[PDB]
Amino acid sequence: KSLFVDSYSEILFFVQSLFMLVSVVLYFSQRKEYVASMVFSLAMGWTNMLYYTRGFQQMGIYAVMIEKMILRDLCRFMF
Amino acid sequence: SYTDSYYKGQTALHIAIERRNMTLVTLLVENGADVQAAANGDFFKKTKGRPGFYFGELPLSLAACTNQLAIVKFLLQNSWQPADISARDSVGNTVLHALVEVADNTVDNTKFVTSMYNEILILGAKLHPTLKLEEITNRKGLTPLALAASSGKIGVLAYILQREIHEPECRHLSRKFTEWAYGPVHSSLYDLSCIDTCEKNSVLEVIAYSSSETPNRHDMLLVEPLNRLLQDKWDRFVKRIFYFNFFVYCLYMIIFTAAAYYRPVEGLPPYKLKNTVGDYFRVTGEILSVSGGVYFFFRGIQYFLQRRPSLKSLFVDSYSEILFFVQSLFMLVSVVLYFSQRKEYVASMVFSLAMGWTNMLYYTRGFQQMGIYAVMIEKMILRDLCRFMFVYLVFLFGFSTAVVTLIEDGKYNSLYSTCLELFKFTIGMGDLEFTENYDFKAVFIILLLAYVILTYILLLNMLIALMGETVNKIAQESKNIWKLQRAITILDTEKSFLKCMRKAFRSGKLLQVGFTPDGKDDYRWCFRVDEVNWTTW
Amino acid sequence: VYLVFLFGFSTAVVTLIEDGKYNSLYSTCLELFKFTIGMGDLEFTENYDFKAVFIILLLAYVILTYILLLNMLIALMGET
Amino acid sequence: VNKIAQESKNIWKLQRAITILDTEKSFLKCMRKAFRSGKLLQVGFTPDGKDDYRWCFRVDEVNWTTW
Amino acid sequence: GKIGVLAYILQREIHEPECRHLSRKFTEWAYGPVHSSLYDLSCIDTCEKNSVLEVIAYSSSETPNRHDMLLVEPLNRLLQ
Numbered sequence: 056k057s058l059f060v061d062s063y064s065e066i067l068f069f070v071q072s073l074f075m076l077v078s079v080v081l082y083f084s085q086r087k088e089y090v091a092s093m094v095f096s097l098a099m100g101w102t103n104m105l106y107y108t109r110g111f112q113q114m115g116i117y118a119v120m121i122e123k124m125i126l127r128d129l130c131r132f133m134f
Numbered sequence: 135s136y137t138d139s140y141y142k143g144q145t146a147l148h149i150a151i152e153r154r155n156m157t158l159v160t161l162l163v164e165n166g167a168d169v170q171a172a173a174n175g176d177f178f179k180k181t182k183g184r185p186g187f188y189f190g191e192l193p194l195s196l197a198a199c200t201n202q203l204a205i206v207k208f209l210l211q212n213s214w215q216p217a218d219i220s221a222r223d224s225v226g227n228t229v230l231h232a233l234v235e236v237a238d239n240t241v242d243n244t245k246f247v248t249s250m251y252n253e254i255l256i257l258g259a260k261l262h263p264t265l266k267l268e269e270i271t272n273r274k275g276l277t278p279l280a281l282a283a284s285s286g287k288i289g290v291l292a293y294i295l296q297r298e299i300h301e302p303e304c305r306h307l308s309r310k311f312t313e314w315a316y317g318p319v320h321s322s323l324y325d326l327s328c329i330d331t332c333e334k335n336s337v338l339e340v341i342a343y344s345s346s347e348t349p350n351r352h353d354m355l356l357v358e359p360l361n362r363l364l365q366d367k368w369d370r371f372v373k374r375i376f377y378f379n380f381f382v383y384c385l386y387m388i389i390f391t392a393a394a395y396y397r398p399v400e401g402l403p404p405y406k407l408k409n410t411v412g413d414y415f416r417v418t419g420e421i422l423s424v425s426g427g428v429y430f431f432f433r434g435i436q437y438f439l440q441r442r443p444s445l446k447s448l449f450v451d452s453y454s455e456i457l458f459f460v461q462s463l464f465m466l467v468s469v470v471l472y473f474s475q476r477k478e479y480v481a482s483m484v485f486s487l488a489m490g491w492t493n494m495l496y497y498t499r500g501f502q503q504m505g506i507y508a509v510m511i512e513k514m515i516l517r518d519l520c521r522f523m524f525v526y527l528v529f530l531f532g533f534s535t536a537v538v539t540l541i542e543d544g545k546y547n548s549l550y551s552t553c554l555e556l557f558k559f560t561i562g563m564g565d566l567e568f569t570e571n572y573d574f575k576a577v578f579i580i581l582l583l584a585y586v587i588l589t590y591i592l593l594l595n596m597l598i599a600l601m602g603e604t605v606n607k608i609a610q611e612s613k614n615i616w617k618l619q620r621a622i623t624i625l626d627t628e629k630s631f632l633k634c635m636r637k638a639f640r641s642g643k644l645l646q647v648g649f650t651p652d653g654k655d656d657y658r659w660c661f662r663v664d665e666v667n668w669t670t671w
Numbered sequence: 672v673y674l675v676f677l678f679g680f681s682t683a684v685v686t687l688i689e690d691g692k693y694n695s696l697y698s699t700c701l702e703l704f705k706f707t708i709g710m711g712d713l714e715f716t717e718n719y720d721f722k723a724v725f726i727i728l729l730l731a732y733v734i735l736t737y738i739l740l741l742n743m744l745i746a747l748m749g750e751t
Numbered sequence: 752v753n754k755i756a757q758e759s760k761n762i763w764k765l766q767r768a769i770t771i772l773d774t775e776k777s778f779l780k781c782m783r784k785a786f787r788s789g790k791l792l793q794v795g796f797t798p799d800g801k802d803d804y805r806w807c808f809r810v811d812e813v814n815w816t817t818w
Numbered sequence: 819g820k821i822g823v824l825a826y827i828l829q830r831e832i833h834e835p836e837c838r839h840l841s842r843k844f845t846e847w848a849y850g851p852v853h854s855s856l857y858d859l860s861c862i863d864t865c866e867k868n869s870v871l872e873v874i875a876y877s878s879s880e881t882p883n884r885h886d887m888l889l890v891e892p893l894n895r896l897l898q
């Protein structure tokens with residue numbers, strides 16, 4: 056429960072790495088579906104750039120608000 | 135005294151004053167202590183990167199800066215060795231400069247700083263009636279008033295500009311006078327010496343041309359006589375000239391627009407002038423447009439030289455000067471390319487044209503509602519749009535790279551086409567099925583839906599929310615910045631003035647007291663303000 | 672403010688365009704106004720040279736009007 | 752956002768602290784300069800005659816009341 | 819997450835003989851309005867196991883005031 060309610064940046068970085076590794080396995084398994092994994096890594100990788108907006112008060116507060124919105128309001132609205 | 139460089143000059147009198155021990159100070163003065171001994175070690179200097187405490191280096195300034203009125207009086211009027219009230223430290227600062235220096239605009243600090251300043255002026259008048267302390271300048275050429283204005287010490291400035299002294303033989307030290315008072319109504323007079331105009335450091339010039347790092351530069355113009363004075367200068371003199379400038383700029387842009395719109399379409403400039411009316415008008419418009427470009431170019435150079443911004447103040451402040459200069463740069467580059475027989479001059483010209491119209495917003499100052507609105511636009515661009523565009527571009531590029539990787543041997547299959555096609559979602563034109571040149575349709579549609587939700591649904595509404603948070607907070611800041619913008623406009627108009635007009639000097643030369651310390655009578659260019667109050671009859 | 676931006680960028684774009692269907696202040700003004708109502712084409716013509724300049728002008732216009740000014744309007748109406 | 756502005760400021764300070772600690776724990780170079788603030792003698796009088804060196808961190812303050 | 823007790827301890831100063839050594843905030847030198855304090859930092863910056871910074875930053879996210887505890891003066895200045 057602590058694994059998800061907080062420390063969500065580390066989870067996102069880990070999920071990126073999982074997508075990369077599944078892409079590697081599918082690449083050597085002679086399956087074209089590795090591309091499907093790779094792009095999800097790639098997109099996710101670029102999005103994780105926002106992690107480095109910590110250490111800047113303005114940008115960091117902006118990214119913190121994105122996290123809070125995704126957790127509360129986007130989920131309620133999407134339901 | 136100490137001889138090491140760090141505590142150099144500190145002597146027992148400094149320690150005695152520092153300890154607040156009246157008895158030891160009296161004893162040391164009795165025994166021949168030097169009341170002019172300057173503590174000029176490194177510790178007693180400003181030196182922001184090191185510990186220390188600047189107080190003007192002198193025992194009198196040390197007492198004044200530490201809220202010890204009794205020691206100040208004793209040092210000034212003791213029998214054994216009176217202190218020189220007009221003394222100056224290594225920086226040239228007198229005691230009053232020191233009192234300005236220690237100010238920090240907190241209530242408790244400002245209270246004693248203003249009171250001690252007042253007391254020193256009273257004593258200076260009583261001991262030296264012919265001496266004018268407030269006209270002494272330090273090594274920077276700044277009087278205590280000019281120093282207070284330049285350093286942003288709004289509390290001290292607000293004290294000084296409306297200082298009123300109700301006692302004999304110190305009336306002439308006042309700067310706020312009451313001329314007549316009938317019922318609840320009375321007409322006061324503000325001095326305005328060295329506010330409106332003076333040798334170098336006019337208070338208005340010092341505030342307006344501040345280096346953007348001064349703490350209260352936006353707030354200082356709220357001090358009463360300054361706000362009223364700028365409104366008076368505006369209404370009487372500058373409103374008309376500013377409107378004329380705006381009209382001329384509008385004519386300039388209309389001529390530029392017409393000259394550009396009817397450019398000839400054949401290749402390889404320059405184009406032969408045809409002997410017809412339309413072409414004489416076109417080439418006339420071109421010449422005027424290039425002329426205006428040259429004018430703004432040289433105005434930009436003049437601004438740069440007259441201010442000499444230090445490559446950070448060059449960009450963090452004075453955006454309008456940069457924008458007008460860049461417009462002129464595009465115009466000149468366009469001229470060069472035109473006569474270099476390159477069609478790329480069109481590429482330059484249109485950029486100038488676009489900037490030329492957007493710089494029209496410069497003239498929204500001079501209208502309170504539009505001026506404040508334009509300031510809010512500026513702050514939105516600098517804060518919210520910049521943050522949003524960073525985050526948005528990160529998202530856009532990330533998902534464009536993913537989608538273009540997924541696409542293979544398609545029409546799009548390129549960063550430009552896919553980036554453009556995903557950007558179309560932001561402007562409400564996203565196709566959502568723009569290609570089928572892939573395998574794994576589920577992956578493609580998932581990527582697009584994730585992109586749409588993250589950018590279109592979450593980020594844009596978040597931008598709206600944050601802009602709402604911002605406007606709630608920048609109302610007063612926007613009004614203050616607009617007032618400062620108009621103040622700069624007023625000063626620049628009056629420094630140009632183009633006619634050697636003396637009416638720009640406002641307020642009229644009235645006699646305040648007519649009795650200085652000597653028999654002469656004092657005329658002091660006062661500014662009249664009527665007030666009404668229904669208490670304190 | 673919106674009309675100032677609209678006219679400025681309309682004049683820039685129509686100056687860039689040459690011998691096209693649009694090539695006129697009215698048509699280009701209308702075509703840029705379509706961005707405001709969420710119908711902006713963003714590739715409505717190719718009768719020019721310097722495609723980079725054309726797209727840069729449109730992106731600048733969109734960013735300044737659509738993203739900044741309309742959302743700023745919503746914020747200001749909310750304050751009012 | 753009007754309700755989480757302040758909480759956001761605090762969270763920003765928090766994860767900057769987390770970054771600092773992770774950097775110091777990784778450090779990849781056997782750098783000992785990360786132990787800052789310098790070993791100063793605080794009191795010089797422990798319960799016995801010894802003096803205490805306590806790695807103190809200096810903070811300057813200015814106050815215009817309570818002379 | 820007992821921020822009140824932490825705020826007391828980290829800047830504890832006891833003014834009497836034979837209890838000075840218990841303080842964690844010491845005043846080295848003083849002038850007029852200026853004076854320089856010294857904070858102890860034992861078991862804040864580093865120690866055997868439970869540095870205060872490690873305990874706060876790696877809190878379990880159920881600690882009530884974890885966001886606020888870093889506002890206590892010596893901690894915030896140390897982190898900067």
Ligand SMILES: C=C(C)[C@]12C[C@@H](C)[C@@]34O[C@](Cc5ccccc5)(O[C@@H]1[C@@H]3C=C(COC(=O)Cc1ccc(O)c(OC)c1)C[C@]1(O)C(=O)C(C)=C[C@@H]41)O2
Nearest residue numbers: 063064067068095098099102103105106118122584587588
């Ligand atoms: C919360 C979980 C871990 C999450 C992980 C993935 C699948 C993710 O989809 C979500 C579910 C989702 C899907 C579609 C729209 C919204 C949300 O949201 C995030 C997660 C949603 C994100 C949000 O991006 C961010 O939060 C940037 C960021 C902000 C703060 C941070 O501290 C941070 O640390 C890296 C990263 C981006 C994706 O990882 C991404 O780029 C892709 C392709 C899908 C997004 O699952």
Ligand SMILES: CCCCCCCCCCCCC(=O)O[C@@H](COC(=O)CCC)COP(=O)(O)O[C@H]1[C@H](O)[C@@H](O)[C@@H](O)[C@@H](O)[C@@H]1O
Nearest residue numbers: 451452453454455457488489492493495496512515619731
């Ligand atoms: C291709 C097309 C691109 C056009 C891009 C630009 C669009 C905006 C154009 C709007 C024109 C408005 C203008 O002409 O300039 C605006 C600034 O707008 C911007 O933000 C430009 C961002 C770059 C006001 O400039 P100002 O000189 O008043 O600056 C203030 C100081 O004077 C004052 O003393 C204070 O220190 C205050 O803090 C300062 O801010």
Ligand code: NA
Nearest residue numbers: 562563709710
């Ligand atoms: Na649409």
